Amino acid sequence: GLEAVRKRPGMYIGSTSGEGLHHLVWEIVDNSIDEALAGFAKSIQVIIEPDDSITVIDDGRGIPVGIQAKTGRPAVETVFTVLHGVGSSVVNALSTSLDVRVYKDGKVYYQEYRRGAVVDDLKVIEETDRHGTTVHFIPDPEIFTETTVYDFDKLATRVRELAFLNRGLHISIEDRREGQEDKKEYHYEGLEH
């Protein structure tokens, strides 16, 4: 399964250099873009956390949490744990840790993984009035041996491109790292312009 991804990451993300490190971001963001395309997500936030980890927040419907008959597991768990807009499990495999929060039907559903392996069963941890999905991941330095340090300008450039290609979407990029905090927000207007 996902162990194959950890041993041959080059076959799944193209490179284990800085390029592959940034590719992880797009693999998660692309899923949020698909939910904007479906018509539900209106805003996406990408955050470089102070420790070079990544958070992606959207306000879509939230990844399905119901048990699938085919697997006997919550759909969201399968998304991150089974190899398949299909790259979530690859990001999981290549991260020291990944946590997902799904905001759906008044509840926050939470699951975490470590180097691709499930920590515990999906659990309701809070009540909420919002909807969407938040994915946070820490890229694995065992995989990304050259660099685990993000390039804000590189991310911002593509985020702007994504805003343009998905006209109407609100998408932002934020750097929370020490001595260089920054945020850029992008939104190209539709017919209301």
Would you tell me which residues interact with ligand CJC (CB under 6 A)?
A: 28, 31-32, 34-35, 56, 58, 60-64, 79, 85, 88, 133, 135
Shortest Cβ distance from residue 76 to ligand CJC (Å)?
8
Shortest Cβ distance from residue 67 to ligand CJC (Å)?
14
In DSSP terms, 48 is beta-bridged to: 54, 175
Shortest Cβ distance from residue 163 to ligand CJC (Å)?
17
Going from the C-alpha of 97 to that of each of 105, 119, 141, 146, the distances in angstroms are: 26, 10, 11, 19
| Nearest to ligand CJC of 34, 112 (CB atom) | 34
| Nearest to ligand CJC of 103, 147 (CB atom) | 103
Burial label, 82 (beta-carbon count in 10 A; 0-12, 13-18, 19+) = middle
| Nearest to ligand CJC of 85, 141 (CB atom) | 85
Q: Which long-range contacts (CB under 8 A, 24 or more apart) does 117-126 make?
A: 118/77, 118/81, 122/65, 122/74, 122/76, 122/77, 125/101
Shortest Cβ distance from residue 79 to ligand CJC (Å)?
5
Shortest Cβ distance from residue 145 to ligand CJC (Å)?
26
Whether 18 and 146 have beta carbons less than 8 Å apart is answered as yes
| Nearest to ligand CJC of 28, 169 (CB atom) | 28
Distance CA 162, CA 29 (A): 10
Residue at token pair 């990304």: 144
| Nearest to ligand CJC of 107, 147 (CB atom) | 107
| Nearest to ligand CJC of 66, 179 (CB atom) | 66
* Number of neighbouring beta carbons within 10 Å of residue 172: 18
Shortest Cβ distance from residue 179 to ligand CJC (Å)?
28
